[PDB]
């Protein structure tokens, strides 16, 4: 099929500023609008990374779009836990160099309990001493962790790519079975947090002007397609270990 991990380490996206206006009042509407603008910028970076991701080109265009749309919150959350861990030792939520959440911002964002759930994942990075190599393989597994209920157009092609990245994670943990299951348990726990993040995101999207929450064009497109699929139960989370 294929070291692809050496490739993963080099294709990691550059740093993205939030463009946060600290002179503006710290309302839920202003903070969430800034987070949505940041999410739009990260999405462009995800597409650029996915195009050069080994094996991703083999999947048909329709499947590539489905995977990116279904996994956007999973990839975003996981990357947030990594930045929080790397830059603050998981003491704060490191959204961007210019946007680091303390207790105050967690309350102001009107997402306090969700922010705490996210901080719990970053605390697991500290407990496990997650490595950058482990992190890059796991991010690929998250891109390949949610599919349509009726499968993808090229299901066999997808399964081959996913299986090969799982083999890469197993090879990596040796540098071992105990660590492999600690990492798969961490990946599985991403689905529950992402579910709660999407529930709130769908809510603010469906009544955005009523709460003054702005969404960039990229998020409008992704959410408009994803929202009816997720609520109709057409999304299928892939678990290593069924709950
Ligand atoms: C730009 N963002 C990120 O870097 C990280 C990502 C995903 O992990 C999150 C965790 C968290 F604790 C708070 C926010 C986010 N992030 C979000 O983008 C997001 C999620 C839900 C939303 C919104 C954003 N926006 C809304 O209007 C309301 O629902």
Numbering used by the authors: 731 to 732, 737 to 909, 917 to 984
Study text:
Notably, AZD9977 had stronger interactions to both the gatekeeper residues (Gln776 and Arg817 at the helix 3—helix 5 interface) and to Asn770. Met777 lies directly in between helices 3, 5 and 12 close to the activation function 2 (AF2) which is a key surface for co-regulator interactions. In the closely related glucocorticoid receptor (GR) the corresponding residue is a valine and the GR Val571Met mutation affects both ligand selectivity and transcriptional activity. These observations suggest that Met777 is critically involved in mediating AZD9977 actions and mutation of Met777 will change the functional profile of AZD9977. The data suggest that the ligands exploit different intramolecular communication pathways to modulate the AF2 surface and to drive functional antagonism with Met777 being a key residue mediating AZD9977 effects. The peptide binding caused by AZD9977 is intermediate, reflecting the partial antagonism measured for this compound.
To develop a molecular understanding of the differential pharmacology observed for AZD9977, the X-ray structures of MR LBD with mutations Cys808Ser and Cys910Ser in complex with AZD9977 and eplerenone were determined.
